[PDB]
């Protein structure tokens, strides 16, 4: 808690790492959340939802 907190506002090197980590985790969480809502809104329309998927003849 206080250990990381005092390092972030005191050293710019730590703060820069905090920005990089936030960009990494923040973008991944948004990408995951957007995909979950995309899957929910498109039930049954996916490529793997095809009933005859695997029997061409």
């Amino acid at each position: 808690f206080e250990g990381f907190y005092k390092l972030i506002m005191r050293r710019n090197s730590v703060y820069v790492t905090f920005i990089i980590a936030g960009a990494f985790f923040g973008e991944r969480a948004v990408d995951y959340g957007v995909h979950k809502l995309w899957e929910r809104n498109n039930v049954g329309k996916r490529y793997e939802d095809i009933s005859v998927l695997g029997q061409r003849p």
Partner: peptide
């Protein structure tokens, strides 16, 4: 103030490399 800063900026550089290049799977 010199060794600690060098360690801190090297850590940020390593974090940036893992963030730009994602070597997930290369960690074997």
């Amino acid at each position: 103030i010199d060794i600690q800063a060098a360690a801190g900026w090297g850590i940020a550089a390593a974090a940036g490399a893992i963030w730009v290049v994602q070597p997930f799977g290369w960690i074997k």
